[PDB]
A paper describes a structure:
Fungal α‐mannosidase [name] and its mammalian homolog MAN2C1 hydrolyze terminal α‐linked mannoses in free oligosaccharides released from misfolded glycoproteins or lipid‐linked oligosaccharide donors. [name] is transported by selective autophagy into vacuoles.
Here, we determine the tetrameric structure of [name] from the fission yeast [name] at 3.2 Å resolution by cryo‐electron microscopy. Distinct from a low resolution structure of S. cerevisiae [name], S. pombe [name] has a prominent N‐terminal tail that mediates tetramerization and an extra β‐sheet domain. [name] shares a conserved active site with other enzymes in glycoside hydrolase family 38, to which [name] belongs, but contains extra N‐terminal domains involved in tetramerization. The atomic structure of [name] reported here will aid understanding of its enzymatic activity and transport mechanism.
Author numbering:
A (entry chain D): 248 to 1077
B (entry chain D): 100 to 198
C (entry chain A), F (entry chain B): 2 to 50
D (entry chain A): 199 to 247
E (entry chain C): 445 to 493
G (entry chain C): 839 to 936
Write the structure that this text describes.
């Protein structure tokens, strides 16, 4: 009933908060020894529980709020990561974007992240990550004048082992993430460390000690931002990231008032840590690097940051992952043949706009929620069509470029003598067996060129043969012999050169054949489409009610077919095939193709192979390298790795022999004590009522080799995943095989991953990377060209050093030297 | 759910508010909304009960003006139908509680 | 003997929180009601008029 | 409704409820807690609806 | 290294020179680091070294 | 810049108890007295009769 | 290498280091009847404890293409950690042995 009491209550309060809380002068007192650094953040999941059309509005409705708040509170600074969101805001509201870039120039509203979207770092291939950084940094350098030095990735469900190197290539030597505080098994050892990649490249990584990037500037948030720092001996500074994220507006203004009062408390009664608001994230990391002598003292983490959570994310939404890998490979082929056509042809302009839009629409569907399969049905009814459209447009672009080169499609009417095969792999695939028009197996061999494989009229030197021994089906070959039980389980996988069995059905728990299909009751704990739990393996059902039939016994590809009844409403048909070959290089192993009518509810269909290999670790393939996981469940850090992510092949080799499992749609593997288990299909229900119900085509090959993991396995994986398009010569005057223009002659572990045209100039960008782990040397052979120079550029294609290019008879043979797991990039100026 | 509504809001402050240096418009429908001015410039968002106040920008308190609210019928995390990670509710009717 | 000489299948140590919270879903009538105990309770419930 | 409840299912429900309480309540160093947890785990692994 | 296995056990009380006290008898079972697998600890009492 | 691109020397996280008890021996006049501070205290002590 | 050491230091640890230009994630030491692969990265607390390991005759450190071994006939303690192999030669303890 009296309003002067309010003011004298405020005066009574000023004995605890101080006199400056009403203005922005609280942050000017004691701004030297600051422990908690506060920054405003607005994490908007591009498509998590709402379509993209809703985020197009969430972006503006949050950022305009932030503009007005930054207008009211002068000390407040704001960060937002994705550049795609900036593009959407400029497409919808151009004037709001003009005011936004005005704020950006005024040192508020810091654009951070330097990537296109906040992508997942496990599933997309390495070139996808490099494209993320390329597109994001080019957008930021174009619109604003900033090049982000801080990789912002607080919501990703697991980090690959090569991310620090990719960051160092694209100019970003910092890293910020928060998700690794959700480890329900192993609290991460540090909070500010040096994340060292597979090869040695390092980024100064920091995790906000408060386990949320959506803090509330409370007293306990400000406290935990320094007091929960897991390694305080190295550096006493934690970042406070306050806001309301996961698809919502940023920090409310009352959070800024609570921050002012927290700083006032720290000034007057010094218990709360000294919050500092007028500092960005780059200044924060610069302080961290200054106080630790350029990070030379902080702990190191060498390799993969394993996120011990959201492990079913590798297997859920299987069709989207299949489409993503097909689209990545098709984009590789598209810009490869487009680079060739723009190089050689005279009136063909490299499709920069078409390929740029295709890459944008591919990277959009690599969001850390869309790709790992953690969205609602509408998000996927939006993402599968745009992804299929990207695939179709990439095929159309490839065909336009190819026809400009002098070829055309197979059309199923040209004679078998006039059929060719486009390779696009940077080495000579000795032979490829493929169907043309009527499941007709045709073999394509190329003894001379690595680009175009001609058909083979002569028979095979080493043909396959599917016959039947006593109630058993034998796919015999020159190399392997697959003895298959009458119920589908491979009773034996014998190697004919090295006379040894590769199964070990006696020991271990798996006692009945390899290629065993198992249905695990999934039933995760909390998040159904995200998580799969370690206790899901105790409840299982083995599918042993199949029936085997000899599908084909021809010389090119022997194959049996097993009709396995999964349950009622669910069925599967596994084709087990062994191909013939001329050279051992051509062989890809025992192929398996599952046609799964999948309708089970909360089930996990996996396939197991006991492999008679006794090693202590298994080599899986990740972006631009090889990650070696344990196989023994020794410590809690190994019990968390009961299912891991792998790109194309999972290897398991002892000193003398080894077994790889290659695939082209699956991403989750588990090797643990002689038993390799590939996770085929999940059936979650919580965010998606019908997640993977339907028909699925799952291809995977068991490729046994007679040495530790060699380049032969990498090449067999790339061949298994590649798409071989049937060509036909259009003109006998331009049908020349120029696809051998860019070669990489040297050690076979050095893969010429990607060929591209420059983002700005007319030079050819070659992404090379050693894939197995040894400092190697090679030679870029540029045959049918006149090379003005060959420089070594970084990921964003700025030159660093100029290579000394030789000059042979007609080619050039640039000599290159790659480190342990280096990802080098070469700009060839013609 | 996901249905959009457009509220043209026409306000007239009482004259006695020549005082009251700050005037607020409160909007607390359980969903998202975004204030547009007469020209289409977004000014402030409403997100459930955690963000309601919209300060009238010291310019259209003197003269009775109008703005617009593009209210989207969904929570901050979609619709849910039982929980946040549950499949969205095709029918979730929101109630306007404060204007 | 009964103790096998070769142990080619590693067994991990059960994490406390995970295997503790797993028991919550055996009697829960929530999302996994049809795979757990609160599905064999009824034995042909009848409520038709 | 007019139910005809599964008596052994209800008995198992009460058993599992008591054991899950023993798991949630007993101190982190009492072997009865872990014996109850092991028995609950085996029950969940054994039960097929 | 090759796969051969031995059933290893460590007396939970961290001494092979226990004193058969009350706290020794207690720790021999209550300090068992994995009680979910087997609830049995060995008490090795004496004065060694 | 000052931040090196290649980190070929790993740094471990300091264990709490070890590096905490290490400080006890800098001022201790015990076994490592000659390597620590209680050796530059004296500056030519004299006690001869 | 053959060191003739007149050793009289007190509480000192003479070791010898070789940076080897090998970038692998593990090092293979030799133990009784086999090869034990230790980490080289100090990632977890189980690796900070292995800052010096036992090896019988040779400590290997090899990437996919090249490798360096360190063989010996009297020493048993080795430490490979990030391109730096360090063989522990001589300790000078004093407490049970003056
Ligand atoms: Zn998110
Ligand atoms: Zn002794």
């Amino acid at each position: 009933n009296d309003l002067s009491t309010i003011n004298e209550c405020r005066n009574l309060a000023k004995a605890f908060l101080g006199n400056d809380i009403d203005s922005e002068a609280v942050f000017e007192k004691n701004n030297d020894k600051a422990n908690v650094f506060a920054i405003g953040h607005c994490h908007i999941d591009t498509a998590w529980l709402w379509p993209f059309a809703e985020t197009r509005r969430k972006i503006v409705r949050s950022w305009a709020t932030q503009m007005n708040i930054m207008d009211r509170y002068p000390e407040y600074q704001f960060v937002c990561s994705q550049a795609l969101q900036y593009l959407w805001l400029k497409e919808d509201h151009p004037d709001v974007f003009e005011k936004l870039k005005e704020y950006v120039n005024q040192n508020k509203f810091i654009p951070i992240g330097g990537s296109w979207v906040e992508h997942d770092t496990n599933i997309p291939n390495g070139e996808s990550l490099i494209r993320q950084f390329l597109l994001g940094q080019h957008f930021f350098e174009k619109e604003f004048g900033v090049r982000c030095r801080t990789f912002w990735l607080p919501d990703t469900f697991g980090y690959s082992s090569q991310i620090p190197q990719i960051c160092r290539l694209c100019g970003m030597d910092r890293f910020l993430t928060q998700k690794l505080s959700w480890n329900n098994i192993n609290s991460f050892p540090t909070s500010t460390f040096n994340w060292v990649a597979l090869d040695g490249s390092q980024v100064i990584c920091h995790m906000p000690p408060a386990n949320t990037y959506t803090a509330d500037t409370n007293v306990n948030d400000v406290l935990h931002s320094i007091d929960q720092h897991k390694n305080l001996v190295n550096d006493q500074a934690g970042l406070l990231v306050f806001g309301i994220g996961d698809g919502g507006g940023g920090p409310t203004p009352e959070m800024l008032e609570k921050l002012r009062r927290c700083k006032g408390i720290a000034n007057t009664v010094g218990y709360l840590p000294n919050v500092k608001l007028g500092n960005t994230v780059d200044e924060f990391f610069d302080g961290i690097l200054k106080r630790t002598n350029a990070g030379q003292t902080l702990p190191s983490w060498n390799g993969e940051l394993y996120f011990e959570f959201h492990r079913g994310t590798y297997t859920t939404q299987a069709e989207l992952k299949k489409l993503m890998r097909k689209v990545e490979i098709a984009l590789h082929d598209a810009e490869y043949v487009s680079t060739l056509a723009s190089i050689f042809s005279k009136d063909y302009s490299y499709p920069k706009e078409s390929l740029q839009d295709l890459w944008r629409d591919t990277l959009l569907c690599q969001f850390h929620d869309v790709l790992p399969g953690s969205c609602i049905e509408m998000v996927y009814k939006d993402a599968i069509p745009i992804m299929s459209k990207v695939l179709k447009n990439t095929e159309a672009l490839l065909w336009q470029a190819i026809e400009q080169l002098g070829f055309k499609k197979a059309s199923s009417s040209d004679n078998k003598e006039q059929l060719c095969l486009l390779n696009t792999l940077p080495w000579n695939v000795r032979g490829v067996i493929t169907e043309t028009e009527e499941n007709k197996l045709v073999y394509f061999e190329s003894c001379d060129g690595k680009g175009i494989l001609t058909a083979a009229h002569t028979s095979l030197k080493h043909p396959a043969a599917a016959y039947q021994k006593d109630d058993n089906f034998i796919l015999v070959n020159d190399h392997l012999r697959v003895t298959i039980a009458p119920n589908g389980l491979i009773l034996s996988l014998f190697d004919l050169h090295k006379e040894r069995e590769i199964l070990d059905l006696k020991s271990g728990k798996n006692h009945a054949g390899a290629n065993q299909y198992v249905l695990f009751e999934d039933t995760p704990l909390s998040w159904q489409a995200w998580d799969t739990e370690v206790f899901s393996l105790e409840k299982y059902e083995v599918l042993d009610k199949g029936k085997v039939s000899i599908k084909e016994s021809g010389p090119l590809r022997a194959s049996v077919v097993v009709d396995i009844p999964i349950s009622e409403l669910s069925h599967m048909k596994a084709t087990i095939s062994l191909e013939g070959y001329n050279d051992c290089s051509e062989f890809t192993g025992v192929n398996f193709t599952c046609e799964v009518d999948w309708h089970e509810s909360c089930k996990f269909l996996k396939v197991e192979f006991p492999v008679d290999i006794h090693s202590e670790f298994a080599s899986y393939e990740t972006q631009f390298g090889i990650t070696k996981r344990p196989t023994h469940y020794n410590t809690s850090w190994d019990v968390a790795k009961f299912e891991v992510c792998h790109q194309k092949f999972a290897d398991y080799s002892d000193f003398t022999y080894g077994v790889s499992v290659l695939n082209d749609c699956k991403y989750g593997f588990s090797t643990h004590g002689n038993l390799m288990r590939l996770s085929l299909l999940r059936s979650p229900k919580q965010p998606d009522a019908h997640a993977d119900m339907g028909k699925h085509t799952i291809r995977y090959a068991v490729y046994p080799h007679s040495k530790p993991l060699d380049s032969s396995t990498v090449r067999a994986a790339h061949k298994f995943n590649s798409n071989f398009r049937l060509l036909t010569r259009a003109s006998d005057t331009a049908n020349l095989d120029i696809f051998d223009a860019f070669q990489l002659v040297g050690e076979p572990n050095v893969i010429l991953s990607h060929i591209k045209m420059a983002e700005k100039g007319k030079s050819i960008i070659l992404r090379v990377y050693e894939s197995l782990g040894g400092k190697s040397r090679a030679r870029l052979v540029i045959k049918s060209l006149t090379v003005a120079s060959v420089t070594k550029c970084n990921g964003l294609e700025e030159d660093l050093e100029e290579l000394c290019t030789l000059k042979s008879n007609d080619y050039y043979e640039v000599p290159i030297e790659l480190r342990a797991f280096e990802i080098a990039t070469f700009k060839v100026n013609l | 759910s996901w249905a959009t509504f457009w509220f043209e809001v026409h306000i007239r402050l009482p004259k006695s508010w020549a005082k009251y240096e700050q005037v607020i418009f409160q909007w607390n429908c359980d969903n998202e909304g975004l204030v547009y001015s007469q020209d289409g410039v977004p000014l402030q968002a409403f997100s459930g009960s955690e963000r309601t106040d919209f300060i009238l920008p010291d310019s259209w308190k003197t003269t009775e003006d109008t703005f617009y609210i593009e209210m989207a019928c969904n929570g901050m995390f979609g619709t849910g139908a039982g929980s946040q990670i549950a499949p969205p509710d095709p029918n979730r009717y929101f109630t306007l509680t404060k204007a | 003997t009964l103790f096998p000489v070769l142990n080619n299948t590693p067994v991990g140590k059960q994490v406390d929180s995970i295997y503790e919270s797993r028991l919550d879903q055996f009697l829960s009538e929530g999302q996994y009601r049809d795979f757990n105990l609160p599905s064999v309770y009824d034995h042909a419930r009848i409520d038709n008029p | 409704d007019l139910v005809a409840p599964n008596l052994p299912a209800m008995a198992l429900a009460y058993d599992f409820l008591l054991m899950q309480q023993c798991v949630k309540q007993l101190p982190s160093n009492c072997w009865q807690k872990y014996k109850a947890r092991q028995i609950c785990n085996d029950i969940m692994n054994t039960f097929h609806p």
